[PDB]
Amino acid sequence: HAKVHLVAIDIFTGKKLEDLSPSTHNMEVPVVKRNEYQLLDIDDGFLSLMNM
Amino acid sequence: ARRPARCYRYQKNKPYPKSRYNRAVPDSKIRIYDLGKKKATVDEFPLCVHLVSNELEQLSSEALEAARICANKYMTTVSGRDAFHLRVRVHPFHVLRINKMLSCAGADRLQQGMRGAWGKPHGLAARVDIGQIIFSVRTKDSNKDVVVEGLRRARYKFPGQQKIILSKKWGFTNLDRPEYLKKREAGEVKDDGAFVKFLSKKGSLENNIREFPEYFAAQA
Amino acid sequence: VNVPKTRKTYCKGKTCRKHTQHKVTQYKAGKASLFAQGKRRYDRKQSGFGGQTKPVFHKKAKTTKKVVLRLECVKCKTRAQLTLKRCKHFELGGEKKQKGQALQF
Amino acid sequence: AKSKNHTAHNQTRKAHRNGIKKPKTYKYPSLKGVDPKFRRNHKHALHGTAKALAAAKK
Amino acid sequence: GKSHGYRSRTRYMFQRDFRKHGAVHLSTYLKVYKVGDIVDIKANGSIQKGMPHKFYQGKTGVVYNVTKSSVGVIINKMVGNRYLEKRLNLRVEHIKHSKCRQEFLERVKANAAKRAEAKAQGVAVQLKRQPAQPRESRIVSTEGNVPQTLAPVPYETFI
RNA sequence: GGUUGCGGCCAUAUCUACCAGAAAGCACCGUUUCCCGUCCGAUCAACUGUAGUUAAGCUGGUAAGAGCCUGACCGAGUAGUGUAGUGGGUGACCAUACGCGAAACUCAGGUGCUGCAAUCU
RNA sequence: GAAGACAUUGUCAGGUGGGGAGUUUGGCUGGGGCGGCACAUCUGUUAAACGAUAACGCAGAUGUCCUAAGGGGGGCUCAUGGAGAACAGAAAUCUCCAGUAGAACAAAAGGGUAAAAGCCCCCUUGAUUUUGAUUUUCAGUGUGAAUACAAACCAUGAAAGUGUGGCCUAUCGAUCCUUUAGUCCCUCGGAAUUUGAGGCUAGAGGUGCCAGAAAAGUUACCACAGGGAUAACUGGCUUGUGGCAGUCAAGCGUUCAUAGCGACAUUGCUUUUUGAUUCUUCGAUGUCGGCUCUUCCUAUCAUACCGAAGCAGAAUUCGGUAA
RNA sequence: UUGACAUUGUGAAGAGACAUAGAGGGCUACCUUUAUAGUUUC
RNA sequence: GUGAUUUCUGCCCAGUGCUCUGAAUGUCAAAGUGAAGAAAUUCAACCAAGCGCGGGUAAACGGCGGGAGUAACUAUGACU
RNA sequence: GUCGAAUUUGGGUAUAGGGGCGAAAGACUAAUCGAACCAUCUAGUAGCUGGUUCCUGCCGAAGUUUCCCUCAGGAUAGCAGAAGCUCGUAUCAGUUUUAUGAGGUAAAGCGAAUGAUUAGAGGUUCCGGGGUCGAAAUGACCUUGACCUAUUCUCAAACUUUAAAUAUGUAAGAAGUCCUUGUUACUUAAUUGAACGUGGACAUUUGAAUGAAGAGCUUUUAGUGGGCCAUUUUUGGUAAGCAGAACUGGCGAUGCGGGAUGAACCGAACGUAGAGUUAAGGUGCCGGAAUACACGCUCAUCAGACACCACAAAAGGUGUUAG
RNA sequence: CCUCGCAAGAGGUGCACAAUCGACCGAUCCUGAUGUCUUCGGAUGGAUUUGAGUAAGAGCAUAGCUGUUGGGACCCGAAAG
RNA sequence: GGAGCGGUAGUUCAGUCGGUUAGAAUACCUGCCUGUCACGCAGGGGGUCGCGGGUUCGAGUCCCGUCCGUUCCGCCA
RNA sequence: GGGUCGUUAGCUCAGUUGGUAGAGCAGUUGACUUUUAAUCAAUUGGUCGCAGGUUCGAAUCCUGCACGACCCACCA
What we know:
Chain B: Sequence repeats lie at residues 166-180, 199-215. Chain B: It is found in: Cytoplasm. Chain B: GO terms for molecular function: structural constituent of ribosome. This is part of a larger assembly, with chains A (52 residues), B (220 residues), C (105 residues), D (58 residues) and E (159 residues). With 220 residues, chain B is of the alpha+beta class. Chain B contains four helices and ten strands, in the order E-E-E-H-E-E-E-E-H-E-H-E-E-H. Chain B is 20% helix and 19% strand. With 105 residues, chain C is mainly beta. Chain C has one helix at 37-46, and strands spanning 6-11, 18-26, 69-73, 79-80. In chain C, strands 1-2-3-4 form a four-stranded antiparallel beta sheet, with no helix packed on it. With 58 residues, chain D is mainly α. Chain D has helices at residues 12-18, 36-56. The chains are: A mainly beta (52), B alpha+beta (220), C mainly beta (105), D mainly alpha (58), E alpha+beta (159). Chains in contact: A-C, B-E, D-E. At the D-E interface, helix 1 of D face strand 2 and strand 5 of E. Chain B binds eight RNA strands through helix 1, strand 5 and helix 2.
């Protein structure tokens, strides 16, 4: 009963992670979207983004 | 390559054309459905012979090709290329399917017996009936002894037995020989290119003048 | 989906029994709390050995939740519920559609 | 375990053994799911028309 | 997978029928339905509200209840071993009157008349419809119309 | 019989290209202060039947017109099909009996009828 | 002597803890697995002209989207082509003519739709409250979806009416538990008050294995019950594939279709290969080969007698009777 | 393994944290910064 | 763990472990502490070890790639 | 093979079961070891095998529906029995007739939409290019290229104007029809309608055929829920004694005559006997029965011989017979 | 069953049973009157609502076939724990 | 005999699965430097995002088919 | 043994998915140079080994054809 061993590098943190599971049972998938913001002056430690 | 046409002989399944559901087919082998003097005004060739199929069956494209070419070459080498105007009166629309298995030792990677049995396309073919007509010819009435031998030669390149009857009626059109002659000598015909057009007692009488000046006047 | 913050719907609260203005707010379950029998009953079963006594759910297939609008009738401040079909987006605020204007660049 | 999935075979032959007994209706059918208003009206009518026959004809 | 919706296998059932599209004609609506009258059920795709289920297309039954723009019809559906009595709620647009019942009623109307006529005659009617009785002994007439003799016809090609 | 308003059936009424229409009828057509509505008195609104027509609309007719319809021993008992056979056929299929029965084609015939109310030389 | 209220020990608590314990690992499945979902649904076709219907049959679709894409009214006519108008051209805006729908209707596919259900405007919450009746799939239970009504209170419209979601057919969930809404009602049972808790009616929080368990492997060390309902050897039916034989004859063969060949086609036969099948055997027919020994069959390698030859001889080829 | 309470006793200092007052800061949360009568955590 | 002798044991600390005399006020139980409340109780900060954040370690488990172009015949490609 | 030691062994002694010992094979642990043995818990559990004990009489099935971590099982409805109960020619009928509905299959159709497609003819362009005639032209003329018009050969499970056969719904009246008139909180402009009525008429052809070994009605419960073959319709599949459906019949569960033999084919269904009559098949002999009758066909140095059914093809032959 | 009818039939009464429309009792949702520690109180009247109801009782106990459930549960039969 | 993946300037590749824009490196080109070529300095162009069809305000990325290449399975007998 | 693919100019490479052949290298010729080489330009060489249909016509379509290149081949 075939397993699957993924190796996945984080989007945010960046560290390289691994997993192994039988492939039927679910690995719950996150949802992703781009905001396409426009970047004005970067103030202090934050950035400053302008939506249209 | 190509399993024998004994498989796809009889009309065992429903018809299955190249449609919005079934596409990426094999293309038909028989491309040229006419040959000889294809710009022949019907007043040239009065004879005709039909190659009539006695039996209800299917006909592969290949069979229709080999036959056509056979009849063709036997006509042109003998009578001369403008002695005849041989049509084929059937087109292969119906498709054949195959499952296709592995050959030398398929044991482990088998493609699973009769599972997913619906086949992909294979080759095109024409559905044919009892008394249905394969191949026209139309020639000069002296030339019969050539066409009769040509069709004879060509029928061997078909599944089953299909007979070679003798028609009347300036045979591509309808309408019998003596009747046709009467129409001609009466003036009830306009010689439209290749095939003949006919007069009527229906359409408005203005447009029957310019088309047909003859029929009604005392001159002809 | 978008819904507006106002809705002149029917109200049943002795004095009302007619169509009135409601303030349309999102339902949210709030705190669960101990002291409910069904919690105490659970905790007692849990304690000791055996360990996990009750079915912990896993196999989630739904992504969304069905939405509920807590309405408040302005007149008598007596409330009522209303449930929709499911959806991913939701805004109880305004921002109405524009008729047929051009795409944003 | 490829078992036979479905058929309707030898079913009609079961059906006709006792055999398609028809509804067996009654005069004065059941006013259930008949218009409420109409039912209410008919009620009062029956209440009245009983009285007429009861009180008068004696 | 398999599918069984409320309009399963109804491509050509609720087809509107050739060159008769749209605009629900107005006899339909003024046809007056009495309680306990027999009605045929031709569904009507050009109206969606109050539609019948596909099973009841062409099926016939009795009206039991009336309302604003509809009629309650009862039908005997066949299920398993028996007949079960249903209660539909069809909009008036899917219904017409039973012609056969009308015909019957007319026949009854004639029957009373026949009875009355018989009475002023002095009884004896014979009113039931007997089938096609095996037609009587008669004499024909040759006079001019002689037996035009035929034969069998020989096999001919003309093809 | 025509014509108007309101219809039922929904082309035997629709479409193409022409020609006729006296009476009234509609119809187009005159005008914008008010009610009214438009980018615009075109549209719809209102005001005049006065200032003018039958040019259109509408009606009717014509055409070996299209279309549509109606029937025909017109094709054709043609396909096709229910029933039966230890019927024929290597089979494909075909014939037989009891019955049922089409479409195209061809020919001929038709080109709105009609109800409610009002009005017209 | 060290050591010292610290350790040690007791009790609770968080971590660690295959070292050990228990348990585990879904179904369908032209055997099993791997693969799909045919496991909840919807469209058209298969479907055999009411319904009803199967296959791992065919071509597709669903878990969304929409305070308007809902509801009412008003106004208007769409795709496309023709002919025209500075920049303007295949197409940018305008105008007339034709335009039975060839468009547009949130999304699959099929229906349905023309002063419209289409597009533009106007005003709006009926996607509202109480509870039944009914139809569909059906056991005539549910769930979902829908239909006709009532009794309210609203919407819009001049009105007739039309509206209890999306023109129609899919778009979604039981118990227990939590939570909210309501009646601000009933119980805490020695009596009360106030907190708390428990009840009633209507929802939400989820079970896609979709009438709803909290669950990973491996066994060639294996075991038990069974199974010819089911694989792997033989046998059988079947022949695609394998092998073998024709018929036809375009071309080859200097010349010349068939001495010898023989394309494109085509009709077969065969059980010697492999497959396809699952009837027989799972309380077992000992499952490859080689050795050994018997016969049998020709579709003839050689040998006897023959005919054909692109046979001068020789050699060799084709064929016939022959096991 | 770690924490708490108990085992459980006698003392000494030296420091941090909570409440009032005085300063140097970006109407004002805090930021650094000294002092007071009490308690507490080391 | 490897397996006499001889000769040699290259690169990789990302993963997984193991480990650090390792910072912090991120995560943080019980008791204890503070606020509120008629009280049950509610809310809060404080917060052990670990977890996390970073550092080491491969005779620890282990691991240790493609694709183009190019030499004055053709090929091949030190070289890019 | 090894044989001076990591040697071999006696006795004593130690280690005890999910534990021991193990130069490691899951080996050894009293012929037991991938967890010893003895007893008990224990008659453990088993949707699975095996068996399940006398006669006769009557009635006599299912292998399908929906749900299930269901696919060898169970619930469920269906079939079958037994108990009856209420009546006593009811109202019904696997049917026809007369009448009237619905259907979108076989057929047909495409010079009809939808698409799929063979050919030329004529047009068209200023509104496509490649040429010749021309410095250019909304150019004089050829070659195509799409378009347009009238014709053409061909087609369709998921195309259709049209449209069968077979199957199919409903009516064929007493619970009816008419005449007078009562009811009401519904509805009407209206004692108009409405549904329900008292009263009066109309009945022995009471309103088609034929049939009714009674009609209706309730209870409860068994087994069952693995099917299979045949005609015709039909999907996958090259095809299959393959797989999957549709309408009847069978077989299971059933003997008998006939198919030599054979579960299903033909005939025909059985209480125990006699008689006579036949069905299907046969009638030289093996078998009971005409080496009957009559007209013809066949010569086979591979005859032929009666369905299911135990095969045969395309192609040939002045062998013969007839047209 | 009675009455009339020689009989055919008609008329009256119509148990059990079947259908139905009503009445009542309870819950639900409305209604709220006379009275009122002025928040108690509930009259009467309703309703496409619902109950395993009433509407002159049909029960109890023993016994017999049958079918169910728990039980060693028709008898034998594991691998195990 | 099937399942999944890839697809772009002359080459390696991001872009791309997020739809109303085609970026990097190298190579190429131009001028400059230099006695001349390299290196460098300062500028410049170049890809119908393999092909064909469809959905789409818009497809290069959305769906379907060829097309050429890379991977996975081939287990129990 | 069989299934698939390809065979192009002196040598190599596109070929267009059907109307006349493109590009590199090689060879010859000129330019350049004191000669050369390298470079720059110009030419020469092409029925794609043999048949059949043939789109008007085909190396390019298809099938045959001989020489290569791939992929497959008892069983327990």
